[PDB]
Structures are given as structure tokens and as C-alpha cells.
Amino acid sequence: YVQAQKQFKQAEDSQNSNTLAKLGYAQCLIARNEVGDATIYLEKFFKENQDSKSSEMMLLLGIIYSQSGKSYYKAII
Amino acid sequence: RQDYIAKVRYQNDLPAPPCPPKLLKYEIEKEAPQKEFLKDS
């Protein structure tokens, strides 16, 4: 998980257009139980890329917000 | 005062507890299945 997350970060730094690398980075954050860190990274990516059609990213955001509970409105959206 | 007999008693009695049927949490409502589903390759 540490090595995979580092590799995903290096992939993102090499070419920022690789959305799949960032999604794998978030998945690795989830793997390391970094719920808050993954949430912050996902919010940063979504706010920078509000027009991106990453359906799985939005599904993961909704699941995370439902687990949080207070952010139900973003989860619905 | 010999007039009409009537008693006034406001009714604000609390009802008995309902004990409604309980919802069952989904499998994705538990932390471990959530972790397994999100960490899918």
C-alpha cells in the first residue's frame, strides 16, 4: 500500500492527465485506512476537476459522505 | 350557581411507545464490507 501509493503519486507527477493514477492513489489511501486523507484528496481533485466525468470517483465520494453522514447532500449529488 | 353541568379536562396524554419494526442495515453499512468493496481492483 505504501509502495503502490508512492508509485501512483509518481505517475501523477509524471503526467497529471492520468486520472486513473490519481484514482489508484485514492484507493491506496483507503487501503491504508486514511479516510480523512482520501476524503481531502478526493475533494481537491473534484474541486479542481468539477467537469471531469469520473463516475467511480463520484460514487466513492457519495459513499464516503454517507459514512460521514453530515455531508448527505454531497452524497446525494 | 344552578346551571348546565359540564366538566372540562384537556387531553394531552402521551401515547404508548410504538415499538415499530426495525430496519436491517445493508451489508455495505458495515465498515469491513465497505473496505472490501472500495479496495476492489
PDB file of C-alpha atoms in Angstrom:
ATOM      1  CA  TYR A   1       0.000   0.000   0.000  1.00  0.00           C
ATOM      2  CA  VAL A   2       2.822   2.430   0.800  1.00  0.00           C
ATOM      3  CA  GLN A   3       4.762   1.411  -2.310  1.00  0.00           C
ATOM      4  CA  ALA A   4       1.660   1.412  -4.523  1.00  0.00           C
ATOM      5  CA  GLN A   5       0.649   4.848  -3.214  1.00  0.00           C
ATOM      6  CA  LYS A   6       4.155   6.168  -3.889  1.00  0.00           C
ATOM      7  CA  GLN A   7       4.039   4.723  -7.413  1.00  0.00           C
ATOM      8  CA  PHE A   8       0.627   6.315  -8.012  1.00  0.00           C
ATOM      9  CA  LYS A   9       1.949   9.680  -6.805  1.00  0.00           C
ATOM     10  CA  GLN A  10       4.966   9.359  -9.109  1.00  0.00           C
ATOM     11  CA  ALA A  11       2.641   8.509 -12.006  1.00  0.00           C
ATOM     12  CA  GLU A  12       0.555  11.599 -11.255  1.00  0.00           C
ATOM     13  CA  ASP A  13       3.662  13.790 -11.067  1.00  0.00           C
ATOM     14  CA  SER A  14       4.988  12.438 -14.377  1.00  0.00           C
ATOM     15  CA  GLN A  15       1.723  13.064 -16.262  1.00  0.00           C
ATOM     16  CA  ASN A  16      -1.093  14.925 -14.495  1.00  0.00           C
ATOM     17  CA  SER A  17      -3.621  13.856 -17.156  1.00  0.00           C
ATOM     18  CA  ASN A  18      -3.583  10.286 -15.799  1.00  0.00           C
ATOM     19  CA  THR A  19      -6.836  10.263 -13.824  1.00  0.00           C
ATOM     20  CA  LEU A  20      -6.506   6.509 -13.268  1.00  0.00           C
ATOM     21  CA  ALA A  21      -3.269   7.051 -11.335  1.00  0.00           C
ATOM     22  CA  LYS A  22      -4.971   9.552  -9.014  1.00  0.00           C
ATOM     23  CA  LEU A  23      -7.909   7.183  -8.514  1.00  0.00           C
ATOM     24  CA  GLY A  24      -5.491   4.397  -7.608  1.00  0.00           C
ATOM     25  CA  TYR A  25      -3.779   6.815  -5.224  1.00  0.00           C
ATOM     26  CA  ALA A  26      -7.115   7.457  -3.504  1.00  0.00           C
ATOM     27  CA  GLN A  27      -7.819   3.714  -3.417  1.00  0.00           C
ATOM     28  CA  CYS A  28      -4.432   3.145  -1.768  1.00  0.00           C
ATOM     29  CA  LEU A  29      -5.257   5.869   0.762  1.00  0.00           C
ATOM     30  CA  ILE A  30      -8.447   3.930   1.501  1.00  0.00           C
ATOM     31  CA  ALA A  31      -6.345   0.771   1.828  1.00  0.00           C
ATOM     32  CA  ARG A  32      -4.142   2.437   4.462  1.00  0.00           C
ATOM     33  CA  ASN A  33      -7.335   3.371   6.387  1.00  0.00           C
ATOM     34  CA  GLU A  34      -6.674   7.052   5.568  1.00  0.00           C
ATOM     35  CA  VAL A  35     -10.346   8.001   5.434  1.00  0.00           C
ATOM     36  CA  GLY A  36      -9.770  11.701   6.077  1.00  0.00           C
ATOM     37  CA  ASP A  37      -6.707  11.903   3.834  1.00  0.00           C
ATOM     38  CA  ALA A  38      -8.536  10.171   0.982  1.00  0.00           C
ATOM     39  CA  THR A  39     -11.517  12.482   1.503  1.00  0.00           C
ATOM     40  CA  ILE A  40      -9.304  15.585   1.333  1.00  0.00           C
ATOM     41  CA  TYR A  41      -7.517  14.326  -1.791  1.00  0.00           C
ATOM     42  CA  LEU A  42     -10.837  13.476  -3.453  1.00  0.00           C
ATOM     43  CA  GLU A  43     -12.308  16.883  -2.601  1.00  0.00           C
ATOM     44  CA  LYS A  44      -9.224  18.604  -4.024  1.00  0.00           C
ATOM     45  CA  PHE A  45      -9.434  16.581  -7.240  1.00  0.00           C
ATOM     46  CA  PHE A  46     -13.188  17.125  -7.622  1.00  0.00           C
ATOM     47  CA  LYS A  47     -12.989  20.872  -6.974  1.00  0.00           C
ATOM     48  CA  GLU A  48     -10.141  21.175  -9.477  1.00  0.00           C
ATOM     49  CA  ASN A  49     -11.939  18.890 -11.974  1.00  0.00           C
ATOM     50  CA  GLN A  50     -15.650  19.531 -11.408  1.00  0.00           C
ATOM     51  CA  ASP A  51     -16.249  18.932 -15.139  1.00  0.00           C
ATOM     52  CA  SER A  52     -14.454  15.564 -15.205  1.00  0.00           C
ATOM     53  CA  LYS A  53     -16.738  12.567 -15.783  1.00  0.00           C
ATOM     54  CA  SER A  54     -15.143  10.214 -13.259  1.00  0.00           C
ATOM     55  CA  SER A  55     -18.260   8.263 -12.300  1.00  0.00           C
ATOM     56  CA  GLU A  56     -16.416   5.953  -9.896  1.00  0.00           C
ATOM     57  CA  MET A  57     -14.828   8.955  -8.171  1.00  0.00           C
ATOM     58  CA  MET A  58     -18.283  10.433  -7.580  1.00  0.00           C
ATOM     59  CA  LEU A  59     -19.598   7.080  -6.334  1.00  0.00           C
ATOM     60  CA  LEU A  60     -16.703   6.867  -3.868  1.00  0.00           C
ATOM     61  CA  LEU A  61     -17.362  10.457  -2.768  1.00  0.00           C
ATOM     62  CA  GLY A  62     -21.012   9.609  -2.144  1.00  0.00           C
ATOM     63  CA  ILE A  63     -20.096   6.505  -0.150  1.00  0.00           C
ATOM     64  CA  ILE A  64     -17.559   8.442   1.937  1.00  0.00           C
ATOM     65  CA  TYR A  65     -20.062  11.225   2.638  1.00  0.00           C
ATOM     66  CA  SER A  66     -22.758   8.697   3.563  1.00  0.00           C
ATOM     67  CA  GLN A  67     -20.309   7.149   6.025  1.00  0.00           C
ATOM     68  CA  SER A  68     -19.677  10.672   7.333  1.00  0.00           C
ATOM     69  CA  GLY A  69     -23.435  11.306   7.486  1.00  0.00           C
ATOM     70  CA  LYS A  70     -23.357  15.087   7.874  1.00  0.00           C
ATOM     71  CA  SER A  71     -22.475  15.529   4.166  1.00  0.00           C
ATOM     72  CA  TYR A  72     -25.550  13.683   2.895  1.00  0.00           C
ATOM     73  CA  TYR A  73     -26.316  16.409   0.352  1.00  0.00           C
ATOM     74  CA  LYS A  74     -22.987  15.996  -1.461  1.00  0.00           C
ATOM     75  CA  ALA A  75     -23.558  12.234  -1.282  1.00  0.00           C
ATOM     76  CA  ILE A  76     -26.937  12.644  -2.998  1.00  0.00           C
ATOM     77  CA  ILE A  77     -25.450  14.921  -5.663  1.00  0.00           C
TER      78      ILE A  77
ATOM     79  CA  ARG B   1     -74.952  28.817  40.507  1.00  0.00           C
ATOM     80  CA  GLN B   2     -77.506  26.231  39.348  1.00  0.00           C
ATOM     81  CA  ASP B   3     -76.810  25.960  35.622  1.00  0.00           C
ATOM     82  CA  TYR B   4     -75.697  23.468  32.981  1.00  0.00           C
ATOM     83  CA  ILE B   5     -73.402  20.731  34.274  1.00  0.00           C
ATOM     84  CA  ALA B   6     -70.239  20.191  32.231  1.00  0.00           C
ATOM     85  CA  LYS B   7     -66.666  19.182  33.048  1.00  0.00           C
ATOM     86  CA  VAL B   8     -63.623  20.476  31.155  1.00  0.00           C
ATOM     87  CA  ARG B   9     -60.467  18.340  31.049  1.00  0.00           C
ATOM     88  CA  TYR B  10     -57.814  18.979  28.407  1.00  0.00           C
ATOM     89  CA  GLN B  11     -56.445  15.807  26.798  1.00  0.00           C
ATOM     90  CA  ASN B  12     -52.659  15.844  26.319  1.00  0.00           C
ATOM     91  CA  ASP B  13     -51.965  12.225  27.235  1.00  0.00           C
ATOM     92  CA  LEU B  14     -48.825  10.745  25.705  1.00  0.00           C
ATOM     93  CA  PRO B  15     -49.414   7.607  23.595  1.00  0.00           C
ATOM     94  CA  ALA B  16     -47.801   4.293  24.410  1.00  0.00           C
ATOM     95  CA  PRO B  17     -44.433   3.551  22.748  1.00  0.00           C
ATOM     96  CA  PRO B  18     -44.956   2.213  19.215  1.00  0.00           C
ATOM     97  CA  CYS B  19     -42.018  -0.211  19.003  1.00  0.00           C
ATOM     98  CA  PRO B  20     -42.080  -0.209  15.176  1.00  0.00           C
ATOM     99  CA  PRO B  21     -40.321  -2.861  13.073  1.00  0.00           C
ATOM    100  CA  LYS B  22     -36.577  -2.287  12.902  1.00  0.00           C
ATOM    101  CA  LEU B  23     -34.745  -1.683   9.645  1.00  0.00           C
ATOM    102  CA  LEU B  24     -31.894  -4.048   8.790  1.00  0.00           C
ATOM    103  CA  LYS B  25     -28.550  -2.485   7.920  1.00  0.00           C
ATOM    104  CA  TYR B  26     -27.193  -3.268   4.474  1.00  0.00           C
ATOM    105  CA  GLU B  27     -24.008  -5.257   4.009  1.00  0.00           C
ATOM    106  CA  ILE B  28     -22.427  -2.023   2.727  1.00  0.00           C
ATOM    107  CA  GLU B  29     -23.395  -0.347   6.014  1.00  0.00           C
ATOM    108  CA  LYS B  30     -20.574  -2.223   7.794  1.00  0.00           C
ATOM    109  CA  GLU B  31     -17.005  -0.932   7.760  1.00  0.00           C
ATOM    110  CA  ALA B  32     -15.306  -4.158   6.649  1.00  0.00           C
ATOM    111  CA  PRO B  33     -17.545  -4.778   3.582  1.00  0.00           C
ATOM    112  CA  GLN B  34     -17.103  -1.100   2.693  1.00  0.00           C
ATOM    113  CA  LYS B  35     -13.330  -1.545   2.820  1.00  0.00           C
ATOM    114  CA  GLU B  36     -13.522  -4.708   0.715  1.00  0.00           C
ATOM    115  CA  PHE B  37     -15.773  -3.084  -1.901  1.00  0.00           C
ATOM    116  CA  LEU B  38     -13.807   0.166  -2.211  1.00  0.00           C
ATOM    117  CA  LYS B  39     -10.426  -1.602  -2.385  1.00  0.00           C
ATOM    118  CA  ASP B  40     -11.583  -3.635  -5.400  1.00  0.00           C
ATOM    119  CA  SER B  41      -9.176  -3.880  -8.331  1.00  0.00           C
TER     120      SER B  41
END
